[PDB]
Design an enzyme around this catalytic site. Structure first.
Site, PDB file in Angstrom:
ATOM      1  N   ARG A 167       2.018   9.078  -6.319  1.00  0.00           N
ATOM      2  CA  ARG A 167       1.170   8.241  -7.164  1.00  0.00           C
ATOM      3  C   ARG A 167       1.899   7.657  -8.387  1.00  0.00           C
ATOM      4  NH1 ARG A 167      -3.500  11.039 -10.858  1.00  0.00           N
ATOM      5  NH2 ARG A 167      -4.703   9.156 -11.385  1.00  0.00           N
TER       6      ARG A 167
ATOM      7  N   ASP B 143     -16.197   3.105  -3.310  1.00  0.00           N
ATOM      8  CA  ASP B 143     -16.625   4.502  -3.243  1.00  0.00           C
ATOM      9  C   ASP B 143     -18.158   4.606  -3.139  1.00  0.00           C
ATOM     10  OD1 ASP B 143     -14.263   3.893  -5.094  1.00  0.00           O
ATOM     11  OD2 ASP B 143     -13.964   6.067  -4.958  1.00  0.00           O
TER      12      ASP B 143
ATOM     13  N   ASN C  80      -3.801  -0.515  -6.378  1.00  0.00           N
ATOM     14  CA  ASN C  80      -3.884   0.886  -6.781  1.00  0.00           C
ATOM     15  C   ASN C  80      -2.661   1.400  -7.551  1.00  0.00           C
ATOM     16  OD1 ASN C  80      -6.346   2.307  -6.147  1.00  0.00           O
ATOM     17  ND2 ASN C  80      -5.902   1.807  -3.986  1.00  0.00           N
TER      18      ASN C  80
ATOM     19  N   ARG D  53       0.812  -1.214   0.000  1.00  0.00           N
ATOM     20  CA  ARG D  53       0.000   0.000   0.000  1.00  0.00           C
ATOM     21  C   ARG D  53       0.862   1.288   0.000  1.00  0.00           C
ATOM     22  NH1 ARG D  53      -1.464  -3.123   5.375  1.00  0.00           N
ATOM     23  NH2 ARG D  53      -0.668  -1.701   7.001  1.00  0.00           N
TER      24      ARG D  53
ATOM     25  N   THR E 119      -7.217   0.044   4.984  1.00  0.00           N
ATOM     26  CA  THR E 119      -8.584  -0.430   4.788  1.00  0.00           C
ATOM     27  C   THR E 119      -8.524  -1.902   4.445  1.00  0.00           C
ATOM     28  OG1 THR E 119      -9.368   1.698   4.001  1.00  0.00           O
ATOM     29  CG2 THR E 119     -10.679  -0.229   3.399  1.00  0.00           C
TER      30      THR E 119
ATOM     31  N   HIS F 263     -11.471   6.014  -9.589  1.00  0.00           N
ATOM     32  CA  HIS F 263     -11.539   5.618  -8.179  1.00  0.00           C
ATOM     33  C   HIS F 263     -10.763   6.604  -7.311  1.00  0.00           C
ATOM     34  CE1 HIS F 263     -11.082   3.398  -4.454  1.00  0.00           C
ATOM     35  NE2 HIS F 263      -9.779   3.296  -4.641  1.00  0.00           N
TER      36      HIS F 263
ATOM     37  N   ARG G  64     -19.508   3.237   0.208  1.00  0.00           N
ATOM     38  CA  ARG G  64     -19.299   4.265   1.238  1.00  0.00           C
ATOM     39  C   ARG G  64     -20.335   5.365   1.105  1.00  0.00           C
ATOM     40  NH1 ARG G  64     -12.669   4.120   1.014  1.00  0.00           N
ATOM     41  NH2 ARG G  64     -12.384   2.974   2.987  1.00  0.00           N
TER      42      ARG G  64
HETATM   43  N1  LIG Z   1      -9.447  -0.102  -5.336  1.00  0.00           N
HETATM   44  C1  LIG Z   1      -9.858  -0.023  -3.962  1.00  0.00           C
HETATM   45  O1  LIG Z   1     -10.972   0.429  -3.704  1.00  0.00           O
HETATM   46  C2  LIG Z   1      -8.957  -0.464  -2.851  1.00  0.00           C
HETATM   47  C3  LIG Z   1      -7.564  -0.694  -3.271  1.00  0.00           C
HETATM   48  N2  LIG Z   1      -6.542  -1.048  -2.404  1.00  0.00           N
HETATM   49  C4  LIG Z   1      -5.173  -1.494  -2.630  1.00  0.00           C
HETATM   50  O2  LIG Z   1      -4.951  -2.863  -2.434  1.00  0.00           O
HETATM   51  C5  LIG Z   1      -3.506  -3.028  -2.434  1.00  0.00           C
HETATM   52  C6  LIG Z   1      -3.176  -3.816  -1.269  1.00  0.00           C
HETATM   53  O3  LIG Z   1      -3.414  -3.250  -0.028  1.00  0.00           O
HETATM   54  P1  LIG Z   1      -2.868  -3.891   1.304  1.00  0.00           P
HETATM   55  O4  LIG Z   1      -3.374  -5.316   1.467  1.00  0.00           O
HETATM   56  O5  LIG Z   1      -3.276  -3.022   2.468  1.00  0.00           O
HETATM   57  O6  LIG Z   1      -1.291  -3.915   1.083  1.00  0.00           O
HETATM   58  P2  LIG Z   1      -0.318  -4.846   1.969  1.00  0.00           P
HETATM   59  O7  LIG Z   1       1.054  -4.236   1.945  1.00  0.00           O
HETATM   60  O8  LIG Z   1      -0.921  -5.122   3.343  1.00  0.00           O
HETATM   61  O9  LIG Z   1      -0.189  -6.206   1.189  1.00  0.00           O
HETATM   62  C7  LIG Z   1       0.379  -6.379  -0.048  1.00  0.00           C
HETATM   63  C8  LIG Z   1       0.752  -7.755  -0.300  1.00  0.00           C
HETATM   64  O10 LIG Z   1       1.163  -7.882  -1.642  1.00  0.00           O
HETATM   65  C9  LIG Z   1       2.284  -8.711  -1.576  1.00  0.00           C
HETATM   66  N3  LIG Z   1       3.119  -8.643  -2.772  1.00  0.00           N
HETATM   67  C10 LIG Z   1       4.092  -7.748  -3.033  1.00  0.00           C
HETATM   68  N4  LIG Z   1       4.669  -8.039  -4.223  1.00  0.00           N
HETATM   69  C11 LIG Z   1       4.093  -9.127  -4.733  1.00  0.00           C
HETATM   70  C12 LIG Z   1       4.249  -9.890  -5.890  1.00  0.00           C
HETATM   71  N5  LIG Z   1       5.235  -9.543  -6.887  1.00  0.00           N
HETATM   72  N6  LIG Z   1       3.472 -10.970  -6.118  1.00  0.00           N
HETATM   73  C13 LIG Z   1       2.544 -11.319  -5.207  1.00  0.00           C
HETATM   74  N7  LIG Z   1       2.347 -10.619  -4.093  1.00  0.00           N
HETATM   75  C14 LIG Z   1       3.103  -9.524  -3.808  1.00  0.00           C
HETATM   76  C15 LIG Z   1       2.964  -8.286  -0.295  1.00  0.00           C
HETATM   77  O11 LIG Z   1       3.969  -9.156   0.120  1.00  0.00           O
HETATM   78  C16 LIG Z   1       1.881  -8.179   0.601  1.00  0.00           C
HETATM   79  O12 LIG Z   1       1.593  -9.395   1.242  1.00  0.00           O
HETATM   80  C17 LIG Z   1      -2.931  -1.651  -2.427  1.00  0.00           C
HETATM   81  O13 LIG Z   1      -2.593  -1.292  -3.728  1.00  0.00           O
HETATM   82  C18 LIG Z   1      -4.039  -0.807  -1.925  1.00  0.00           C
HETATM   83  O14 LIG Z   1      -3.936   0.480  -2.291  1.00  0.00           O
HETATM   84  C19 LIG Z   1      -6.779  -1.015  -0.994  1.00  0.00           C
HETATM   85  C20 LIG Z   1      -8.084  -0.476  -0.500  1.00  0.00           C
HETATM   86  C21 LIG Z   1      -9.237  -0.185  -1.419  1.00  0.00           C
HETATM   87  O1  LIG Z   2      -9.676   3.773   1.642  1.00  0.00           O
HETATM   88  C1  LIG Z   2      -8.773   3.577   0.853  1.00  0.00           C
HETATM   89  O2  LIG Z   2      -7.492   3.398   1.284  1.00  0.00           O
HETATM   90  C2  LIG Z   2      -6.372   3.832   0.435  1.00  0.00           C
HETATM   91  C3  LIG Z   2      -6.389   5.335   0.114  1.00  0.00           C
HETATM   92  C4  LIG Z   2      -5.757   5.850  -1.034  1.00  0.00           C
HETATM   93  C5  LIG Z   2      -5.783   7.215  -1.341  1.00  0.00           C
HETATM   94  C6  LIG Z   2      -6.451   8.105  -0.497  1.00  0.00           C
HETATM   95  C7  LIG Z   2      -7.094   7.609   0.648  1.00  0.00           C
HETATM   96  C8  LIG Z   2      -7.062   6.238   0.956  1.00  0.00           C
HETATM   97  C9  LIG Z   2      -5.133   3.373   1.209  1.00  0.00           C
HETATM   98  C10 LIG Z   2      -4.043   4.232   1.448  1.00  0.00           C
HETATM   99  C11 LIG Z   2      -2.932   3.784   2.174  1.00  0.00           C
HETATM  100  C12 LIG Z   2      -2.912   2.476   2.690  1.00  0.00           C
HETATM  101  C13 LIG Z   2      -3.991   1.600   2.468  1.00  0.00           C
HETATM  102  C14 LIG Z   2      -5.109   2.050   1.734  1.00  0.00           C
HETATM  103  O3  LIG Z   2      -6.162   1.190   1.516  1.00  0.00           O
HETATM  104  C15 LIG Z   2      -6.534   3.047  -0.887  1.00  0.00           C
HETATM  105  C16 LIG Z   2      -7.920   3.299  -1.408  1.00  0.00           C
HETATM  106  O4  LIG Z   2      -8.081   3.264  -2.736  1.00  0.00           O
HETATM  107  C17 LIG Z   2      -8.983   3.540  -0.595  1.00  0.00           C
HETATM  108  S1  LIG Z   2     -10.597   3.813  -1.248  1.00  0.00           S
HETATM  109  C18 LIG Z   2     -10.761   5.592  -1.458  1.00  0.00           C
HETATM  110  C19 LIG Z   2      -9.624   6.425  -1.424  1.00  0.00           C
HETATM  111  C20 LIG Z   2      -9.747   7.808  -1.559  1.00  0.00           C
HETATM  112  C21 LIG Z   2     -10.993   8.414  -1.741  1.00  0.00           C
HETATM  113  C22 LIG Z   2     -12.129   7.613  -1.785  1.00  0.00           C
HETATM  114  C23 LIG Z   2     -12.017   6.221  -1.643  1.00  0.00           C
HETATM  115 CL1  LIG Z   2     -13.470   5.273  -1.722  1.00  0.00          CL
END
Ligand SMILES: NC(=O)C1=CN([C@@H]2O[C@H](COP(=O)(O)OP(=O)(O)OC[C@H]3O[C@@H](n4cnc5c(N)ncnc54)[C@H](O)[C@@H]3O)[C@@H](O)[C@H]2O)C=CC1
Ligand SMILES: O=C1O[C@@](c2ccccc2)(c2ccccc2O)CC(O)=C1Sc1ccccc1Cl
Ligand SMILES: NC(=O)C1=CN([C@@H]2O[C@H](COP(=O)(O)OP(=O)(O)OC[C@H]3O[C@@H](n4cnc5c(N)ncnc54)[C@H](O)[C@@H]3O)[C@@H](O)[C@H]2O)C=CC1
Ligand SMILES: NC(=O)C1=CN([C@@H]2O[C@H](COP(=O)(O)OP(=O)(O)OC[C@H]3O[C@@H](n4cnc5c(N)ncnc54)[C@H](O)[C@@H]3O)[C@@H](O)[C@H]2O)C=CC1
Ligand SMILES: NC(=O)C1=CN([C@@H]2O[C@H](COP(=O)(O)OP(=O)(O)OC[C@H]3O[C@@H](n4cnc5c(N)ncnc54)[C@H](O)[C@@H]3O)[C@@H](O)[C@H]2O)C=CC1
Ligand SMILES: O=C1O[C@@](c2ccccc2)(c2ccccc2O)CC(O)=C1Sc1ccccc1Cl
Ligand SMILES: O=C1O[C@@](c2ccccc2)(c2ccccc2O)CC(O)=C1Sc1ccccc1Cl
Lengths: 323, 324, 327, 325
Positions: C101, C161, C133, C98, C243, C188, C164
């Site tokens: 950008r 989004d 992301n 995480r 999150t 997003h 929420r």
């Molecule tokens: N689109 C959305 O609405 C949401 C998107 N995201 C995203 O989800 C992603 C993950 O979030 P977290 O679980 O909190 O991160 P985290 O750091 O807790 O976990 C990431 C995992 O990916 C693994 N990883 C790293 N390189 C890898 C590879 N080459 N192959 C396989 N696995 C690998 C790590 O070792 C780790 O276990 C982030 O990009 C975060 O921003 C998170 C919240 C909401």
């Molecule tokens: O909730 C989220 O967490 C992250 C985020 C990214 C950018 C800005 C705020 C939060 C995040 C940041 C750091 C570590 C872990 C995370 O999951 C990643 C992420 O996409 C969301 S969703 C979200 C984010 C911003 C606005 C509205 C929404 Cl619905």
């Protein structure tokens, strides 16, 4: 342009062959209870209904379809023609009428080859009575390997038993274990040695368990399993809900490849001194390939003799049937 | 010492009462469809069944009981006496015949409703028996309940059918096809065209002829099909059961779990759309542990208000002549 | 004879293939929440987990296996090698640490260059669901690298989004979020677009009742609901670091529609070239019909001049970043 | 007229007590795993979280709330103040910290937690997960003043689940259909009851009389050893256990909230059994329902098995008599 085309841009029209399809043949009380139970358990992505009575069949389909908002089974179809059943993973036969057996055999002569033509790799689950014989009949007609022909068998009998045991003990039936094997219905065998709560054997605590001389009359729990079914027919005319729920429990194990153990009817030649092609209920591991394995229950001499007598009786009937 | 005592050491015998009891009155096709759907949804810790046909009642009870291994409702009871229904959170009335139709179900209700109120004075009443809008008024009059605790299944099923048909036409799941059918359950129900949408996109704005005779796609016939398909199903299989059972269980879910989801159900609409009579019609209602806590004031066109008003006058015309 | 053979008689040993297999790549907070939610919704007959941290991966695998008694997913497997992922229907990418950008993009592109071809090798016919992301850019990236058709590359997009948004709307109205409808679309996160015209309860348009809705002249400041979607997200990160639960639930809902072929409509990220004056290969959220072929159709939402300008601006920025990516 | 007033006509404001409320105390990995599993199983109409770390608590609360669209639990609350826990049917305690200090330190935590819980939910059932669970169940019982039926320790519920998983892997059968009981003291001193191990009511011990002994050719004893090695291994590998305990706890919660009267291996006061006469809590199969533990199953144990439980009771009482309340 149409309202649909103004609202929706299509990326592709291509339709896949159904992935998790169930067919129920026969939309009587049993068939429809199986259907509603299957639908509320989210086991299928497509449900097909088949019967010979066309108006009834259409009416049942529509009634279910009108409930679609409350379900997660997006395609529900029906027809007299078995083309509606193509590519079913599981086909459940609930259709039915020495006279009575042969009448059901005649039904199965039409049904089974039609099922096979449109789902040649499906598992067949036979509910129609008498279930042990008709599972044998479906096996013979289909030409399927024995693993893919399963009879509902004593699944319901065991469920009833566990309900009655639970009532007597003040414990949910899920924690009341006990197995009714052999021939479905009147001649079934309660295996007293396996009856337990938390691994504590009732027979070991109470050696009179399952004998006539038992002061608590625990034998009546199995007698009431048979008496229950006659009473329900007397009072309401048919059984449906319990059988529907029991069939859905079997379907769950098959469709989800659970490998849980259920008392179902399987081809038992080679056990218990049985040397004929008969189906009887033993505990079987159920999964994506149907019955992959069975549990070898250690039976008492009297238990063995009851299974053998059923085998002889069933075979005595089966050898007389014309296909 | 019995085997039970040999097996089980009892800590306490403090007997309990159910926390989430539901009663179904009438164990016909509808009642049992409601029951099985409620059972497969884990909404009740106790289910009670009531009917006047004693053998049928016992046999249906037994049949459900026999599937207990596959359920999470630990006690199913039945009886002719309403003592079996005591302390019900929710009592669903599905008893009666499928001018004469009304007065006979009224007579049934003169027996049923006082008996329900006697044993479960704080329950929510959910009326399914037809004509549902009239019998909801009747239940409310006889019970003396506040209007929030008397709910008719109303147009929940009509709207469910509409959404099914809409979905088939658009190739979208009914869950994602939004559309409300309000007013009187049955022939005189009103399709609210202005509310019909997928993903918040108004179909009426995209297609101004939607719901008019000028419509080349004849969407008006979708509402006609909703009104009809009930007759169609009765003609084909003799009755309807599954769809209504599913819809009742959806309402029961919102009530029993205090969800405050919005459903179109029959409620007292006096005070709305120029209606002055004590009539029940379907509008969207917020449903929860106190029954109907709130209603949504749908903005209706003049034609739509006129239609609801006409229904209110008709229903009142029948109701004023009923004898309690 | 062994105890097993005394107890059990084998009818056949044909080893077949899983029918409803799901893989989750990256077992961090997001990936594991995805996993537990999918397990508790009985969506899969086999779950595979992949990560590069081998001990963490095994421990997570084992911890889920230990709850098998309480689940109906009979096989859970894990490994660094992608052979554990073979024949997946749905592969969910939650990999990458995480979170600037652009540097996030840079490092997650590099990870994807390794992940995506290995996924394709073992599951050529899967649907890819991208959560990592920035999700819109990484959905493009997965589509470019995989060579998959457009329908089979889905980005989580505005699904969270919008959830929420619906939570917050429901809180102000005293109505369950299920009965509060409204769509947050486009990019997003920070630059998402609330579509005021679609917000409704029971088909009753909030904007029609309240014409100032979403404008600076609104005395009830409903525009703060969308702002609070953005603020909510930052606040959760501040409070707990990340999150997990909401995103996991939201992803399991998407998996549900796909695995069960529901054809429900979700706000997810898809190739939007051809809409809103957008002529570049960009992925943004619109409402999409999801089913067994992934995104089979998309809904054409009527947007205001302003809403359309914001999507167009996002598309311009995203394409500006994407055109310089080296594959 | 606001938009809300224009859209919605109110019939009554009369809000009621929540009817099916659960509280989780402690929002670490265990507590949150319990929370998510309880939410996905639709067991509560209101969930309350409590912890002493305020920022983490709010964040976990909000993160759950943001998933509300996908759940059927309409109210999620949290706070440092136990007023958020009022009228809970069930309160799950996962809060917790040489190693005899460790006990007294968790006793000290319980001295604060338990009276607050009782004050706001006098009629609740207590479900203790915190370790060492058997001692801490006694502590909760002692501080709360509750009848023994309303203080339940997680005990060997997880131990048995692992055992059934492992048994299932060995036999190629789903754990659901593999029956076997691990009883006594949770953790390293637990007892596998070989006599009760079965598939389809077919005793493994009867088929294989050496089962669970040192003469056992197949060393089924390893399954129980693996039950303990597994838990150490998970900690070594990921740092904690969460998912499996969360699921096993939701299963206990389901039985209680729905009054199912299923039988689970949980920690209850076993005074008067197996020659034990001290106030100690050990796992036996218990019937679980709306008033908690109403009944227990009297498992027939071998002399060796009774001896192991006796030693546990003696060791547990030894520690307990030294504790300060
Ligand atoms: N689109 C959305 O609405 C949401 C998107 N995201 C995203 O989800 C992603 C993950 O979030 P977290 O679980 O909190 O991160 P985290 O750091 O807790 O976990 C990431 C995992 O990916 C693994 N990883 C790293 N390189 C890898 C590879 N080459 N192959 C396989 N696995 C690998 C790590 O070792 C780790 O276990 C982030 O990009 C975060 O921003 C998170 C919240 C909401
Ligand atoms: O909730 C989220 O967490 C992250 C985020 C990214 C950018 C800005 C705020 C939060 C995040 C940041 C750091 C570590 C872990 C995370 O999951 C990643 C992420 O996409 C969301 S969703 C979200 C984010 C911003 C606005 C509205 C929404 Cl619905
Ligand atoms: N194994 C078990 O534990 C249970 C077995 N059964 C059996 O289920 C069967 C049916 O039960 P009910 O539904 O109550 O009977 P039913 O008479 O109500 O319905 C049977 C259906 O079979 C249909 N049918 C007849 N011939 C057909 C054909 N050639 N093709 C397709 N459909 C055909 C009929 O049209 C009818 O709709 C009976 O054999 C009954 O004994 C019933 C309860 C328990
Ligand atoms: N609101 C809706 O959308 C729907 C409404 N309905 C209605 O539901 C009602 C019942 O339909 P069915 O179940 O098909 O009828 P049914 O005839 O199968 O069953 C009715 C039951 O009511 C019982 N009953 C009669 N008088 C009673 C009394 N005084 N006390 C207790 N029970 C009594 C009967 O014995 C019978 O068991 C009808 O009024 C029907 O119109 C039916 C389907 C949909
Ligand atoms: N019985 C069983 O089978 C299981 C037992 N456990 C136990 O669960 C407990 C917690 O485990 P984890 O979540 O992994 O530990 P953790 O350290 O991550 O979380 C514990 C939480 O308790 C909180 N806490 C401490 N004092 C508190 C107080 N006075 N009031 C409210 N909250 C307080 C902490 O702030 C922390 O958030 C431990 O005792 C652990 O041993 C864990 C796994 C299995
Ligand atoms: O319960 C059942 O109902 C039927 C039956 C068959 C033979 C004797 C009694 C009942 C039946 C009869 C008429 C109409 C519909 C029916 O379902 C069919 C049937 O197999 C069962 S199960 C059963 C039957 C007898 C003993 C023990 C058990 Cl567990
Ligand atoms: O699995 C568990 O994890 C912990 C543990 C305690 C002692 C030895 C090993 C593990 C743990 C330790 C540190 C941090 C977090 C934890 O959850 C706590 C705990 O009771 C279990 S279950 C268990 C433990 C030992 C043997 C058999 C079983 Cl079934």
């Amino acid at each position: 342009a149409t309202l649909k085309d103004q609202l929706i841009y299509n990326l592709l029209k291509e339709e896949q062959t159904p992935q998790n399809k169930i067919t129920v043949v026969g939309v009587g009380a049993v068939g429809m209870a199986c259907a509603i139970s299957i639908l509320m358990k989210d086991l299928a992505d497509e449900l097909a209904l088949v019967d010979v009575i066309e108006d009834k069949l259409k009416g049942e389909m529509m009634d279910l379809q009108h409930g679609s908002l409350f379900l997660r089974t997006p395609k529900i179809v029906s027809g007299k023609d078995y083309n509606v059943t193509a590519n079913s993973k599981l086909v459940i036969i609930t259709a039915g009428a020495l006279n009575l057996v042969q009448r059901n055999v005649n039904i199965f002569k039409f049904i089974i080859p039609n099922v096979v033509k449109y789902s040649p790799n499906c598992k067949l689950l036979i509910v129609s009575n008498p279930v042990d014989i008709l599972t044998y009949v479906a096996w013979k007609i289909s030409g399927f390997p024995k693993n893919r022909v399963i009879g509902s068998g004593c699944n319901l009998d065991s469920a009833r038993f566990r309900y009655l045991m639970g009532e007597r003990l003040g414990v949910h039936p899920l924690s009341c274990h006990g197995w009714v094997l052999g021939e479905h219905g009147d001649s079934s065998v309660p295996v007293w040695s396996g009856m337990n709560v938390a691994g504590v054997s009732l027979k070991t605590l109470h050696p009179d368990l399952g004998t006539d001389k038992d002061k608590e009359q625990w034998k009546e729990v199995h007698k009431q399993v048979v008496e229950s079914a006659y009473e329900v027919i007397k009072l309401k005319g048919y059984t449906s809900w319990a059988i529907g729920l029991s069939v859905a429990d079997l379907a769950e194990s098959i469709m989800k490849n659970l490998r849980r153990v259920h008392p179902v009817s399987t081809m038992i030649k080679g056990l218990y001194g049985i040397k004929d092609d008969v189906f009887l209920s033993v505990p079987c591991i159920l999964g994506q390939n149907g019955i992959s394995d069975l549990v070898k229950v250690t039976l008492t001499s009297e238990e063995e003799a009851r299974l053998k007598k059923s085998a002889d009786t069933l075979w005595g009937i089966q050898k007389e049937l014309q296909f």
